[PDB]
Amino acid sequence: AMGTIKIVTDSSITIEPELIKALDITVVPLSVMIDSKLYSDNDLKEEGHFLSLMKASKSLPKTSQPPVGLFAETYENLVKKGVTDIVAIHLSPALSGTIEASRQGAEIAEAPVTVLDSGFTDQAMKFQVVEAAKMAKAGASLNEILAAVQAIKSKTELYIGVSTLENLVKGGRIGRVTGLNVKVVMALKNDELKTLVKGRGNKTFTKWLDSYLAKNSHRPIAEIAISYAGEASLALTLKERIAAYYNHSISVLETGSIIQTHTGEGAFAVMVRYE
């Protein structure tokens, strides 16, 4: 297949930077306002650092999608480097208008961008981005990349637990929750956060997870990942439970500032991709 394909995503992805570097993925940053100062999310990836900033702030941080003009410049630079097709994969439009900004920036740049809704964010979105970038590097065709991305998307599930509704309420994403200090597990399903279970202690999360795995793990999992906002202890406890049903490596990462702002501390996601 003639041409050079590159992958673009946004900074709501959660991934080791060694993979970004190995695969030449371009990550467009969102922004976050912290007590009247504007930060690029790409500057907020050092472990624990945003958590400290959020915990100390006088008021809740506020996120915003990347500027249309930042996408335009990003795509113009890629075309200048000789890139002939660009695949942009973004967090769900249920969560952010980032994906629209991406499409608008591409229009301005007059760039060959195919803009995809991942349906997720964080490590569930990483599943699609890594596959696309690996295949782009190998010289796969655009159509093969698009089919493979869609296959991954169709076999992915994302479950998120929160320990408070305050961040969801104050950042507005409570508007997606289909149902302030309580434990809740939701599925990110279509355009909504579908409430599955509600409870008082961390046992809300482990009971839910045990009943998920008992029901579903007979279907071979290709990959499973956990992310967290706050301290890692809860995620690591969850990892231990998954490990009893599932033999392979489990990626446990701190989620980024964009997600932390909207979930608050004591949140996690379990993200599963079936074979």
Q: Which does 69 bind (CB under 5 to 8 A by kind): ligand HXA, Cl ion, Zn ion, none?
A: none
Please report how many Cα atoms fall inside a 13 Å half-sphere around the Cα of residue 83, on the Cβ side. 28
10 token code pair:
């946004």
Pick from 255, 249, 248, 250: which is nearest to 269 by CA?
255
Please give the angle made by the CA atoms of 178, 67 and 74, to the nearest 5 degrees: 115
Please report how many Cα atoms fall inside a 13 Å half-sphere around the Cα of residue 224, on the Cβ side. 25
Residue (140 or 235) nearer to ligand HXA, CB: 235
Cβ distance 98 to 91 under 8 Å?
yes
Residue (30 or 133) nearer to ligand HXA, CB: 30
Helical axes 98-109 vs 68-80, angle rounded to 10°: 50
Q: Is 63 annotated as belonging to a binding site? A: yes
Identified binder of ligand HXA from the candidate list 25, 88, 90, 122, rule CB under 6 A: 122
Least distance CB 219 / ligand HXA (angstroms): 22
Pick from 131, 156, 157, 163: which is nearest to 146 by CA?
131
Site membership for ligand HXA, residue 228 (CB under 6 A): yes
Site membership for ligand HXA, residue 65 (CB under 6 A): yes
# chain residues binding Zn ion, by CB under 5 A: 14
Q: Is 96 annotated as belonging to a binding site? A: yes
Binding interface with ligand HXA (CB under 6 A): 30, 63-65, 95-98, 121-122, 160, 173, 188, 227-229, 255, 258-259, 262-263, 267-269
Which residues line the annotated binding site? 63, 96
Binding interface with Zn ion (CB under 5 A): 16, 24, 46, 49, 85, 107, 112, 191-192, 223, 230-231, 251, 265
